[PDB]
Design a protein around this ligand. Structure first.
Ligand SMILES: [Mg+2]
Ligand SMILES: [Mg+2]
Ligand SMILES: [Mg+2]
Ligand SMILES: [Mg+2]
Ligand SMILES: [Mg+2]
Ligand SMILES: [Mg+2]
Ligand SMILES: [Mg+2]
Ligand SMILES: [Mg+2]
Ligand SMILES: [Mg+2]
Ligand SMILES: [Mg+2]
Lengths: 180, 206, 261
RNA sequence: UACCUGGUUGAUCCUGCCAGUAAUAUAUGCUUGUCUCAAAGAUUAAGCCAUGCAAGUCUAAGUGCACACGAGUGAAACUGCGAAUGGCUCAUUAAAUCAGUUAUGGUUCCUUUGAUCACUUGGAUAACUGUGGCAAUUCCAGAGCUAAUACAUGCGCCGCGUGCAUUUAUCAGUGGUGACUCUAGAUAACGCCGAUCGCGCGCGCGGCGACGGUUCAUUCGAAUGUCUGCCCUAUCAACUUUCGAUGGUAGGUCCGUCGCCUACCAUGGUGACCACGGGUGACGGGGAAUCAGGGUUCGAUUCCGGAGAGGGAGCCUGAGAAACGGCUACCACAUCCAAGGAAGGCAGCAGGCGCGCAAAUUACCCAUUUCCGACACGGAGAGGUAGUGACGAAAAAUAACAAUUUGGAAUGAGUGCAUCCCAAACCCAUGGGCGAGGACCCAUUGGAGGGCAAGUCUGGUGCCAGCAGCCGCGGUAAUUCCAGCUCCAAUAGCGUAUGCUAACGUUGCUGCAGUUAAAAAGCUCGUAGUU
RNA sequence: UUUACUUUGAAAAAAUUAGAGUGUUCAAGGCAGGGCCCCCCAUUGAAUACCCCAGCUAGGAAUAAUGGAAUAGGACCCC
RNA sequence: CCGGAGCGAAAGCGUUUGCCAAGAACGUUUUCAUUAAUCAAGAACGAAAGUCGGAGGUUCGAAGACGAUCAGAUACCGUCG
RNA sequence: UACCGAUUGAGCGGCUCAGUGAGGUCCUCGGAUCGGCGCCGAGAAGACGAUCGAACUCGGUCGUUUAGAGGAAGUAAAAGUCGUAACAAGGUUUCCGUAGGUGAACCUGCGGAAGGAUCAUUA
RNA sequence: GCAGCCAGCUUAGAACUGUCGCGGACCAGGGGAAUCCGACUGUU
RNA sequence: CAGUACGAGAGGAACCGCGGGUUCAGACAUUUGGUUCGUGCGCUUGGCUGAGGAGCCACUGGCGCGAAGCCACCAUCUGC
């Protein structure tokens, strides 16, 4: 009898074929295109998409006049259009099945800061967040795997304490200054 | 100790069942009554819930009632004559429920003469010698003699019942549970129930 | 299994308390009292979680040890009092008069001052037991014993009794058309009007309750808690009597109000 | 993602299994810089245990002359209550536990809530003072005082009355029930009615509380039954009773029903729709893993219920225990003796031995969570926290921006102070400060013939040593082995062993097969079953 | 004549799972919080589904059984 | 004659005549009126060899003897049984 | 690697027949004793009987685990000896059932089967 | 449909009872596991 | 004696003294045990005297206990 949780779920799924020549390049292409650490992150976003596809799939099997499909279906749609992976015009569960892995990779924080020009390259965009620079509505984020929403997309900027923003410089800037 | 549980018996199919747990206290049992005939020996038993239970080991008096009439007088239990369960409850003189006994008839006649004013258990030929019995055959007031007339018209008891009044031993039956209640209450046989046990006593004593 | 149990795990507690699973292992086991353990709310929760006036379990003790709370006007000291249904919790030190009443769902709400109504309550009679020499008895809701009942009251009606004298003032007969607040799960807090009563010899009887917007359903006879004669209640109701806004309807109100604030 | 690939042959199409593949969970191998969570002596041994702890408890309110401190908190002490919960483990248990269902009209209760309900007489006694026994224990003995909330004390019948609890018998019909032999009424009869306490006024009084009893309540709950549902086994087919097996009568017994038991009678009850018997690496369930669907497997394991405390058995006390952190024996085991005796149960929390492939600290504290008692105060190894921890899970370094190698620029990990945090400490997290260019502050683990992504590379080892899950590689130019470089799914994880799931339509209900690849009884009759 | 079958509701522990709601910096999770100097998710939450089988509750009468009259102790009304 | 013809549940069944009681198919405006199909448990039958008890033992012929062949035949071949 | 195996097996373990039976409860009694004060009261040790029943000494039965001289197989090795049984007409067509016999595969009889080397052989 | 009468001798069950003793004398198989030989009964 | 002499150790004596025992010898019956036809007492089977009572019979009816005697390293005493 301990006051704990013991509730934890996995975020990735290892593929069936370990050395599928066609699959190895399709995941490696997503590595450099979005600047990912290893294949685990590819399988992670692939697993989140697989859950959303299966969640939308079981709803499409029910009748349209079912209140469970109407409520649970709209709630899934509102969350997809909230984060920006799906557009408000294509707000239907049929468009969920057409979502690809790159649709959720674009909503990644390290990619949004690259589309906004705050970073030089996609790999530097990871280090830009890894060094505690990017903030979202005065809330600084350190991990690059953050997902922004549409009501928070136009608030991605530098922190009030980062050298790239407005504040004190880094420790290397102050080190070379005192020695010169 | 003694237990009345069911997990020690065989199933309805005949297969032996293994005990799920050891003997529990809430299913305990205690020895049988075996209430003999003796003066005022009763033990108290603490039971489930802190209550009290009265264990009657030997009792000599019994609060029996009369069936035909409305009379409940405590009388001295003499002996047991027959028991439908087994003849062992009468060879050992054990007072239990639904056993026919031969109880005294002095309290029954004492109230019958004071209410009906009619000799019933008197010997055929002998008269009332003591003066206390002549007061039941005197002349009373107008408001007192009028009520005894309407009571004398309905007094012809069955001939099979008036015979026991001659010997002073009425065939009664313990209608209570002595070991549990602590009191050997009951009633007196009459009608068809009196003829049934008399036939069993006649066969057993024949 | 050797006798009575004196502990209550937090995950084993009734869901109507909404306790934090990451703070402790045990739930506040409500002290023995007038109400069932499954249909009550420990006095600590109502003072620490609902009202938030207590921060820990020792500070709520200081509430009862200073004689400020008083259920039905009688100051209690057990921080785990049942405080079941219709139990008026008046606070004369703070002027607040709470009644633990259910919401559209099954939960204990913070229903505030009802001074002119809090002086009494409603009680569901259970049985009509005959005492000595022909004196009937009535067992009320919160274990309050009332004697000398009217010969017209049955085992299903409701009565109102003042907190001081504890005498039956008025009663509401049970028939098709009386306002009711269904209790017993999946309808706890749904306020409606009784419409039908099915009879089952040897088992439970079925009754049908129709809410304000026509949300008619069915339930057992032992689930009726009459609260008003006809369609008018006696005591103040919380925000939403028995409307029971659906998941889609509750969704509409939350988005339309947050955008304005 | 509703997936397959190698291997029988000179070659081919098949049957078919082996092997390959991916999760899962135990162990183990090598490796391991950060953070947040988190399993953790279940598996073989419910084997055995050194030491310590885990239930005691005092308010203004049952009893208050330790002068230790000075009326009053007082330590001891007697009375009341708890210790029957929690925790631990899964040995036992196969209609049993358990789950749904529900019956008690077939049953009782501590605490709580609400009811209701003979001017205080009696004598000891503890602590203590004092005298002692035994080697020794939570051993006690003798005497002398001193307390109880311990213990004891408006009618029937016929002159003239007036509370009851229970047990039988009889009569009549207030509130009920689907249905009372119900609750009520009446007749004849047969241990409950307060000898108690606190902070506190007026002038024979009242208004505020506690404790406690009596039958009815309520509630926390227990206990016993109805209906339905358990894996494997027919090399278990009949089974149950000269000691109840099935039913009948009466009684005993228990809170109560009952073959629960006794006695008289009947020859019954169950069974191929699988009883009975046996096995289980069987506690049941909620659930877990894997799954297109259908399923397969797992559930000792924090919740619920049950079971047990070395094996049994039998009890005390209490409302509730057949209690073992309570007793009485026997059995097994074992400790101190002065050898007369005495005292033992860690499948409680740490720890030790043993067992093993297999599993942490004799750590800190009642603050949270709550629970127990005389209770705001006191107690809790229940619990909380920390250490150990690559069970497992979520985040996430080993560069980046530049140059054609050098410039700064950005940041912790680490390393040192405050604050926050915490019951205190601790991991963080934060504020500045101290902090990387072979940014040496450096990543390994299986591999590189095919299956199956990656070298006829380099050298020697020459059917030897070895490699290889399978097919297969070595008999002096080995793409396999013995090494480098390089390369590859990788990745702070990665191999290995075993269980199990998918693969497997190779258990086929969905959904397989039986002419020749494993296979329709030689043939027909025939009940149950199935249709 | 009554069953099997389908649909509805209460019941069919919590946790877990599915799953609405909430930017624990994200996530695993948790059941808790963005903003205006004592109001403001209209006295800030808040839901639901599933819970097989059996029993229970309210319809339908297809399928498959069963069954009411043949020595008519036949169904109805009489009288 | 005797056949890729019949019959029987199969194993199996062919000289004449006689006896005995069955059977499919067909015929039918007969009759009975769902009395069915398949079938764990159970049973009839079941070539041949073999086994026990009698008769008869022609031929064949396990075994066995012997004759031939072969490096060797404990066999095929031959006589006999 | 299992099986058979005298041993009149056996370390090993469960329900039970019949004995014996601690301990407790209960009952029938007993009356050491101290409170009255020479009778009513309380009352321990202890005992008869009943009942529950651990455990022990012998047996029956079931489950389960193991020793065994010796005997007889299977499989994996090297395929060493012998012969050629089978695969082409395998040189006697193969094979089934059954029986007997034989160093060995095998031979033979009887009845089969084609999985035969014949789907066929003439009025 | 039985009432009356007559007639024995066994069997079962129960209480009580004595020193747990009772087929009280008498009468009246020790048993089990194996080997050898002869089958057995019979005969010498 | 003595853990001593002796021995590097490991080991390890002897005389006097004390207390017992083996075998044997000679006794003996207080005790324990055996025997009992003192046929002593009790009980008891079958039978017999009509029964009770009291007895007898069954080559000592049987059983329990058993005196006196005799007797046992199976009890005890003594042995220079
Ligand atoms: Mg021999
Ligand atoms: Mg002979
Ligand atoms: Mg012979
Ligand atoms: Mg002979
Ligand atoms: Mg002698
Ligand atoms: Mg005689
Ligand atoms: Mg005589
Ligand atoms: Mg003679
Ligand atoms: Mg003789
Ligand atoms: Mg003798």
């Amino acid at each position: 009898p301990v006051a704990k949780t013991w509730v934890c779920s996995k975020t990735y799924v290892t593929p069936r074929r370990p050395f599928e020549k066609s699959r190895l390049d399709q995941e490696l292409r997503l590595i450099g295109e979005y600047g990912l650490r290893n294949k685990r992150e590819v399988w992670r976003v692939k697993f989140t998409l697989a859950k959303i596809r299966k969640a939308a799939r079981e709803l499409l099997t029910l009748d349209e006049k079912d209140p469970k499909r109407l409520f649970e279906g709209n709630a899934l749609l509102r969350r997809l259009v909230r984060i920006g992976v799906l557009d408000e015009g294509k707000m239907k569960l049929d468009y969920i099945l057409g979502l690809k892995v790159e649709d959720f990779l674009e909503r990644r924080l390290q990619t949004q800061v690259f589309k906004l020009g705050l970073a030089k390259s996609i790999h530097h965009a990871r280090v830009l967040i890894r060094q505690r620079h990017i903030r979202v509505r005065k809330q600084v984020v350190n991990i690059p795997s953050f997902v922004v929403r549409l009501d928070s997309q136009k608030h991605i900027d530098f922190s009030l304490r980062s050298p790239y923003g407005g504040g004190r410089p880094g420790r290397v800037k102050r080190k070379n200054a005192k020695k010169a | 100790g003694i237990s009345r549980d069911n997990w020690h018996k065989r199933r309805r199919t005949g297969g032996k069942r293994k005990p799920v747990h050891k003997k529990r206290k809430y299913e305990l049992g205690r020895p049988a009554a075996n209430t003999k005939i003796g003066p005022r020996r009763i033990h108290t038993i603490r039971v489930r819930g802190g209550n009290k239970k009265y264990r009657a080991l030997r009792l000599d008096v019994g609060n029996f009632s009369w069936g035909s009439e409305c009379c409940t007088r405590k009388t001295r239990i003499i002996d047991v004559v027959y028991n439908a369960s087994n003849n062992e409850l009468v060879r050992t003189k054990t007072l239990v429920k639904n056993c026919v006994v031969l109880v005294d008839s002095t309290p029954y006649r004492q109230w019958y003469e004071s209410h009906y004013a009619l000799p019933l258990g008197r010997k055929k030929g002998a008269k009332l010698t003591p003066e206390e019995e002549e007061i039941l055959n005197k002349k009373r007031s107008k408001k007192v003699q009028k009520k005894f007339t309407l009571r004398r018209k309905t007094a012809k008891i069955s001939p099979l019942l008036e015979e026991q009044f001659l010997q002073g031993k009425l065939l009664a039956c313990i209608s209570s549970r002595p070991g549990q209640c602590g009191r050997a209450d009951g009633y007196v046989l009459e009608g068809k129930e009196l003829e049934f046990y008399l036939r069993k006593i006649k066969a057993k004593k024949g | 299994a050797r006798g009575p149990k004196k502990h209550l795990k937090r995950v084993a507690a009734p869901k109507h308390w909404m306790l934090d699973k990451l703070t402790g292992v045990f739930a506040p086991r409500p002290s023995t009292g007038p109400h069932k353990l499954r249909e009550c709310l420990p006095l600590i929760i109502f003072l620490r979680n609902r009202l938030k006036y207590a921060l820990t379990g020792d500070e709520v003790k200081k509430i009862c040890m200073q004689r400020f709370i008083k259920i039905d006007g009688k100051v209690r000291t057990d921080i785990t009092y049942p405080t079941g249904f219709m139990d008026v919790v008046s606070i004369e030190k703070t002027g607040e008069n709470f009644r633990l009443i259910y919401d559209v769902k099954g939960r204990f709400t913070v229903h505030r001052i009802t001074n002119e109504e809090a002086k009494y309550k409603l009680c569901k009679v259970r049985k009509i037991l005959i005492g000595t020499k022909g004196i009937p008895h009535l067992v009320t809701h919160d274990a309050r014993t009332i004697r000398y009942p009217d010969p017209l009251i049955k085992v299903n009606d409701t009565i109102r009794i003042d907190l001081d004298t504890g005498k039956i003032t008025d009663f509401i007969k049970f028939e098709t058309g009386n306002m009711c607040m269904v209790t017993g799960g999946a309808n706890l807090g749904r306020i409606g009007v009784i419409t039908n009563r099915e009879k089952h010899p040897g088992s439970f009887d079925v009754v049908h309750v129709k809410d304000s917007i026509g949300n008619s359903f069915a339930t057992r006879l032992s689930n009726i808690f009459v609260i008003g004669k006809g369609n008018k209640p006696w005591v103040s109701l919380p925000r939403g009597k028995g409307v029971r806004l659906t998941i889609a309807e509750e969704r509409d109100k939350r988005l339309a109000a947050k955008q304005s604030s």
